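TEACHING EXERCISE
Course module: macromolecular assemblies
Task: Read the component lines below, then compare them to the predicted structure of the full complex.
Student: A.B.
Group: 4
Components provided:
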Amino acid sequence: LVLAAQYESLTLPLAVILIVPMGILAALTGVWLTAGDNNIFTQIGLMVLVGLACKNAILIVEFARELEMQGATAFKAAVEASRLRLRPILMTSIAFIMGVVPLVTSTGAGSEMRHAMGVAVFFGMIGVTFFGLFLTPAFYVLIRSLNS
Amino acid sequence: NISKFFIDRPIFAGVLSVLILLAGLLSVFQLPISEYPEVVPPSVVVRAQY
Amino acid sequence: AIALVVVVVILFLQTWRASIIPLLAVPVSIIGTFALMLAFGYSINALSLFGMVLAIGIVVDDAIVVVENVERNIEAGLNPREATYRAMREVSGPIIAIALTLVAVFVPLAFMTGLTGQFYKQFAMTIAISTVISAFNSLTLSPALAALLLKGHDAKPDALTRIMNRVFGRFFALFNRVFSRASDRYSQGVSRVISHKA
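Instructor-supplied answer key:
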């Protein structure tokens, strides 16, 4: 509802909402690869993944719509929107990836409590950024071509 | 004008109305029911036997 | 009551579009009331339901006023967008004024002492919340729906309009003639009444 009200359309938020499961996939694969369990602290770490995926998708879609309104076709608008946003996503992905390594390698009091969330976030972040970079322009163009 | 904002964006009004409807539907099921409101003053009863 | 208002709107306005606006305004303005009661710590009883039944009339009145003004503006000869602009240009102020005066009427009579005030408080608070929510809904939903669904006087009729014309073709004309004659007589009567005032 909030996204549809913001975007003045009833189909655009579908592209943003159809991206969040991939971060959950990445986190669950990361936690399954090692000896782990889906405890409460693991469930805690998926909220940030979903929020960051939404943050990534929303602004790219906004820029694509802004360029579309100017008089360029969906192909060029999507290509330019994908091109113009590479640097901030690269910055935040690198910062958050390198900022959670001490959580994984923790010893002492409460080591496991930090370890579970650290492994979950660390193994979900790569999937989140990969799919956010390589999936949303196609979703946007497909949705745009559906209406015509 | 307040109405001119909503005239050109019917979807905003639709979202607001749907939010109000959802809030009402969620809240209606958590409300006490009685035939009459509390009008009888409270009282305390002490019982003894001899 | 919903069926009755839809029927009377169809009969008086002779357009199937205008019946949509009240149908989507009556329920919401009721349901949104319920939540606010949980904000004030109230419970439903006979008085609250009676208040709802009575405020349904005020909600219908407000919707009727807005729709009728927009339809009159359309019958003047303007397109839907400009007709809606002009109609809402002279209704928001009185809407806020009537909401405020209904609040000023209803709020203080919830402060009686004794049993009478205990019975009055729930009814007054429920009706005040209902009318406030109805005014808010009328300020937002109604003009947008009127501008979106309603069409011009020179547009090609659709299938539903064709059916309603072929079923009710002479009743509408007879009603229009009777209404015009009655309006002329009432105008003459009010002109006569105004002359003598002592």
